[PDB]
Amino acid sequence: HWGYGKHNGPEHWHKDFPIAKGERQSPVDIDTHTAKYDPSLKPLSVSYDQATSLRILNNGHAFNVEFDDSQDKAVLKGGPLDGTYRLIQFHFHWGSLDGQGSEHTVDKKKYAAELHLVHWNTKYGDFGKAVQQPDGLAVLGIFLKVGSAKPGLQKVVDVLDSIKTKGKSADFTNFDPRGLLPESLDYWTYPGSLTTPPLLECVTWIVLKEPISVSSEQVLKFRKLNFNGEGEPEELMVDNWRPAQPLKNRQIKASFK
Ligand SMILES: CCN[C@H]1CN(CCCOC)S(=O)(=O)c2sc(S(N)(=O)=O)cc21
Ligand SMILES: [Zn+2]
């Protein structure tokens, strides 16, 4: 089974999933000097005032927080999109030192971690049907750096010792995602895919320019988790990111001058 080690990491994935060498793969490096400003784009519209969270889980690859998507309650629209996209889950990727951790890079620079918020297009009915189409998903990414603490992240870090190993879950209600966003909403955008297998080419990426700050005691807690199951040898959950792939066919656009 796939993973991030010496014998089953990124350089091996193509043997079971051939699309790994396709024409619109992610992540990539963003060169700020080549990107072109586009004056016809529209501002982003984020409406999370009615969100209902349910549970938190460790899946062997990272940890995820889930929401109830049976009605329009937390949605994303505008920007380069046409239509309405509904929120289903969020997760993170990080490193073993403060100098590495993120998947996307800026003029060759790497940050300590990267946060991903996932949404699907309502015209298709539900989630499973949407991942099989070219314009099915929309993912919003935000960078993390080490400095002062972020108040709204604390409730997540205090529950981690109850889901240490693979297969564990716990109740997690009334959490508000508006507390993890920066001041400004200016961005970059291009067409791509998922960053872990099955690697399907169904995503419209939207990456924010301004990062958020967290303390060293907070990211320390992330590194104490495990990749293995209860009653098995200990392997620490660190360095779970895929590196930069070829641009080829595409061009990147910016909403700011
Ligand atoms: C471990 C498998 N992770 C996949 C599969 N997915 C199904 C998980 C059930 O949750 C609904 S997913 O479509 O949600 C999604 S989004 C991304 S990313 N890193 O944002 O590009 C990876 C994935
Ligand atoms: Zn991700």
- Domains defined along the chain, listed by start: 1-257 (3.10.200.10)
- Coil vs helix vs strand at 134: coil
Contact (Cβ atoms closer than 8 angstroms) between residue 117 and residue 75 = no
51 lines ligand 1 (CB under 6 A): no
Structure determination technique employed: X-ray
Which residue's CA lies nearest to atom 21 of ligand 1?
Answer: 194
Contact (Cβ atoms closer than 8 angstroms) between residue 122 and residue 135 = no
240 lines ligand 1 (CB under 6 A): no
Structure-token match 């205090």, residue found: 158
Q: Rounded CA gap, 4 and 227, in Å?
A: 10
Which residue's CA lies nearest to atom 2 of ligand 1?
Answer: 196
CA atoms within 13 A on the CB side of 67: 25
Specify which residues 188 forms β-bridges with: 207, 254
Contact (Cβ atoms closer than 8 angstroms) between residue 16 and residue 232 = no
- Return residues with CB closer than 5 A to ligand 2 (ion): 116
Instruction: Point out the residues that are catalytic.
Output: 61
Q: Rounded CA gap, 154 and 176, in Å?
A: 12
